[PDB]
Structures are given as structure tokens and as C-alpha cells.
């Protein structure tokens, strides 16, 4: 499962961090701090194991998009999640500069929460995610009209 997601610097500093499951954010920030030494080696280009976790990650311009997972997590699925997260970030921020990500931070976290709840993922398209975030509800619109009715 995906314990947490982070966009972070190549030096191990979180630009944003979102814990989904069984992990405090402070613990996330500590894992990321030790992350760059595992990643900068040509060990693998996508995954490194450190502590009792695995980092699934890709470059995001000069940043890193990073999922933290337990070591038994389905890695094929987690690479697909990572791509989906990366696609969200690019579609949401005008640029992939740190400052611009920071501008869209809380929007980015709300989107991440549409994808992962408690570590598990939904097979959502970017369109469904955009739709969820819009929060347009027929019931809500219909209830206020039933309201003004009475």
C-alpha cells in the first residue's frame, strides 16, 4: 500500500507531503531526508528500498515525485499510481517549479486523497479526479430547490 506521497527536492526536503496510512508526516519527512543517497546511485531508476519501506519515484523536472510504500506493496500498481500522481501535478501546476507546486499545494493534496484512501487506490482517470474535485452534486442542487419550494 501507499503510505504516503511527497514532492521533494533532490536533497531530501519535502515541498509537500501527504500521509495516507499508518505513518506520521514527521516520519515521512525523516524518510525523505535519507532518500537521496539511495536514489542518486544507479541502483534502480524508479525504486529503492530503505528502512522497512520502498520509495517509488520519478523526476519531476528538478524535483522528485515520491510514493512511500510497505515492502510487500504491488510494485506494478504503485508505478502506475506514481505516473497518475505525476500527471495530476503537471496538469494542475502551470510550471513544475517548487514555488508553483507550493502555490497549488492544498489542491494537490485534495487530489491525492481522491486517488488513495488508507493506502488503497482507485482506478480513476484524470477526468474523474477533476470531476470529483469539482464537487457538483445533483442531490444538493435539487434539495435547495425543494427547500425554496416549501
Amino acid at each position: 500500500v501507499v503510505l504516503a506521497a511527497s514532492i521533494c527536492t533532490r536533497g531530501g526536503k519535502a515541498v509537500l507531503a501527504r500521509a495516507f496510512h499508518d505513518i506520521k508526516r514527521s516520519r515521512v519527512e525523516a524518510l525523505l531526508a535519507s532518500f537521496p543517497k539511495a536514489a542518486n546511485s544507479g541502483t534502480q531508476h524508479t525504486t529503492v528500498e530503505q528502512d522497512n519501506v520502498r520509495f517509488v519515484y520519478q523526476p519531476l523536472d528538478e524535483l522528485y515525485m515520491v510514493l512511500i510504500t510497505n515492502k510487500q506493496s504491488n510494485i506494478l500498481q504503485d508505478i502506475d499510481t506514481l505516473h497518475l500522481f505525476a500527471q495530476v501535478v503537471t496538469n494542475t501546476c502551470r510550471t513544475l517549479e517548487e514555488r508553483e507546486i507550493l502555490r497549488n499545494a492544498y489542491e494537490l493534496i485534495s487530489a491525492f486523497d481522491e486517488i488513495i484512501n488508507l493506502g488503497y487506490r482507485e482506478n480513476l482517470t484524470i477526468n474523474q479526479i477533476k470531476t470529483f474535485l469539482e464537487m457538483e452534486s445533483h442531490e444538493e442542487r435539487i434539495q435547495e430547490i425543494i427547500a425554496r419550494n416549501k
Binding site: 493534496i109 488508507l118 488503497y120
Partner: protein, 371 residues
């Protein structure tokens, strides 16, 4: 200090401006300083707002603000917060309910959860799958962190599960049930066991997850699990096939099973476009090979099929694994393939293939030395 300025922003703001204030408040807090005198301002000028975007910032603040005073007792303001949450748990907007339910999965203070329980329980029977999928996780979460609040949670979820039609709610339901009640998840699994091969991917994944758990607690079900797992080697998604092959080796040292899982891994290395995935499953093949010397030698020509990936790292890994399986029985068949690859690097993409071509010449030279 800066608190005052914030406080003034909440007092005089509108929805649009308060959204920017709440964003500053959040950033300030996460980065270090908790703004203590703010709670009551947020309750007064943010919570009664109707702006959905602002409401999400509110719950983000609820996640991080301190709940307890100096004497380890819940702050009084959160009585007012609970009326707010209980209203959001009853909102016409399905999304608000879903977002509020996600939040409750993070709440730990029983004194906050207790006045919300009836509303949460009601959400299990909402018409909208967006609400149901979040409520069943909420219920399992309350029970994990505060069992006395809902001692019948395992029964609730079981019931939720028996009538559920939404695949995402079915997946969440089974995950939630098994996280709090092995036995009742087991019974549920038994009723659906014959249809697992045509279950949806997500549910298939957690069903496999659970089967590994029960194979250890109840080893008498392990053969029926093994047969089912073999069948899942032919699943339609690559995630499930990967999950079935990882589990099958985890349950038995049997060479038939090992070779079978190996072959599925090799099929993935061939089928999947992502070269990092190719490298990952190749290392699964490699490790099986180390722990079972001999068992996979029949798959050597399938390994070599991976060489039709244009990536030099994929090509290098495939050749290493293959060379560690070259025996007298197959060396000539292997060298003929290598040469045929070598010939193709002269005709196709001569420049890009320079590194690969040298690697082929080297591997062919290896085969000569080994014999």
C-alpha cells in the same frame, strides 16, 4: 504578533479571502508555529461558511490543530466542531460527506467520534457509492482506534458487503472487514470463492492479500488457495498476474509452481512497456533462479526474447540471467540467437546499438569460455 493579523483576516474576510487566510494559517502551522488563539476565530468565521473549497481547508486545519489542553483533556471548542462535522456528515453534497468520512479515518479522540457515530453508521446505506466507499473505511477505522465506540463493526461491514454492488465499495468493504475480523472476512471469501477468477482487479488484489494471511493461520485451506492462485496466473490485468506470481512462490517451493511463476514474470518483462517494470520483474526471475538452481533453465529462450527491448539496461539484465543458465544442452541454441541479434545490430539502428553490439560480442565470447 502575526496571529492578530490572521485573526483580523477571519473577522473581516469573505469566502474568497478566507481561503487565502486559511492557506497561510495551514502553511504557518505545518512549518512549525501553531497559532493557538485562532481556533475560536476559525469556528466563528470559517466553519459556518458555505464555500466547499474553504471547507476542505477547514478539515485540513482540523487534522493538525491540537485537540488537548494542558491537562490532557479535550478542548471545549470541539463540542462546537462536532456539530459542524455531524452536519457535514449529513450534507446533500455526496462529496462533502465523502471528504468528511475520509477525515474521520484520521480522528483519534473518542470524545470527538462518539457524537458522530450515528451519522457515520447511516452513511453505510447512502445511495451514492462515493459516500459508501468512504463510510466503510471510516467504520473500520473507528473500530481499529476506538473499539468500544462500535463493537458491532465487523457485523456492519459484513452486512454492507453482502448487498454491495459498486466494485470500489466491494474492494473497500473486504479490505475493511479483514482488517478488523479475520474470521468474518474468511466466511465472506468462502461464499465468493468460485467467482474470484472473474472478480474485478482491485478486489482480486485484496482477495489474494487475504489468502496469504489465511494460508498461515489455517494451513488446511492452502491447497484450495494454491489451485486458485494458479488460475490467477491467467488474470487479465498485469497487476493481478504479478500479484499471483509473487504469492505462488511465497506459498510453495514446488518447481512446477516456481517455473510457472517465473514464466509469468518473463511474460511481463516482454509484455510491459515500462523498462523499469521490465527490470523489476527480471530481478524476480533472477532471484527465483538463484534459490532454485536448474528449475528455470527451460525458460532461457523466453528470457532472451526480452532482448527485443531497445533499452540497454533491460538488455544487459536479460543477458546476465541467460548466461547464468547457459548449459551444454542449450549453449549452441543460445549462441545462434546472440549472433542473430548481433547481425541485426548491423542492419537496424547501427548507431544506437553500438553498446548492445559490444555486449553481444562479449556474451558470445563468454559462452565460448564456459565450454
Amino acid at each position: 504578533p502575526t496571529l492578530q493579523e490572521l485573526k483580523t483576516q477571519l473577522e473581516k474576510g469573505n469566502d474568497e479571502t478566507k481561503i487565502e487566510t486559511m492557506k497561510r494559517i495551514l502553511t504557518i502551522m505545518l512549518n512549525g508555529d501553531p497559532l493557538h488563539g485562532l481556533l475560536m476565530h476559525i469556528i466563528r468565521f470559517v466553519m459556518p461558511s458555505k464555500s466547499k473549497p474553504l471547507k476542505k481547508l477547514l478539515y485540513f486545519y482540523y487534522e493538525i490543530c491540537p485537540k488537548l489542553d494542558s491537562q490532557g483533556k479535550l478542548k471545549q471548542e470541539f463540542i462546537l466542531v462536532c456539530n459542524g462535522i455531524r452536519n457535514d456528515l449529513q450534507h446533500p453534497n455526496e462529496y462533502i460527506r465523502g471528504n468528511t468520512l475520509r477525515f474521520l479515518c484520521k480522528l483519534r479522540e473518542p470524545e470527538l467520534l462518539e457524537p458522530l457515530l450515528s451519522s457515520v453508521r447511516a452513511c453505510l446505506e447512502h445511495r451514492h457509492a462515493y459516500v459508501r466507499k468512504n463510510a466503510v473505511f471510516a467504520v473500520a477505522s473507528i473500530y481499529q482506534h476506538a473499539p468500544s465506540l462500535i463493537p458491532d463493526a465487523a457485523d456492519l461491514i459484513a452486512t454492507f458487503l453482502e448487498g454491495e454492488s459498486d466494485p470500489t465499495c466491494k474492494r473497500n468493504g473486504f479490505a475493511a472487514l479483514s482488517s478488523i475480523s479475520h474470521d468474518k472476512a474468511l466466511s465472506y471469501l468462502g461464499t465468493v470463492f468460485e467467482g474470484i477468477p472473474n472478480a474485478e482487479e482491485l478486489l482480486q488484489l485484496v482477495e489474494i492479500e487475504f489468502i496469504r494471511k489465511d494460508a498461515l493461520h489455517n494451513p488446511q485451506n492452502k491447497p484450495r488457495y494454491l489451485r486458485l492462485i494458479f488460475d490467477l496466473l491467467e488474470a487479465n490485468t498485469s497487476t493481478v498476474v504479478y500479484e499471483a506470481a509473487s504469492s505462488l512462490t511465497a506459498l510453495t517451493n514446488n518447481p512446477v509452481a516456481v517455473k510457472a511463476a517465473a514464466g509469468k514474470f518473463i511474460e511481463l518483462a516482454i509484455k510491459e512497456a515500462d523498462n523499469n517494470v521490465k527490470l523489476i520483474v527480471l530481478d524476480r526471475v533472477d532471484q527465483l533462479r538463484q534459490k532454485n538452481e536448474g528449475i528455470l533453465d527451460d525458460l532461457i529462450m523466453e528470457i532472451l526474447r526480452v532482448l527485443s527491448s531497445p533499452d540497454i539496461d533491460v538488455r544487459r539484465k536479460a543477458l546476465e540471467i541467460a548466461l547464468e543458465m547457459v548449459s551444454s544442452k542449450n549453449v549452441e541454441e543460445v549462441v545462434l540467437l546472440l549472433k542473430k541479434e548481433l547481425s541485426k545490430t548491423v542492419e537496424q539502428e547501427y548507431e544506437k546499438n553500438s553498446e548492445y553490439r559490444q555486449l553481444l560480442i562479449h556474451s558470445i565470447h563468454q559462452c565460448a569460455v564456459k565450454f
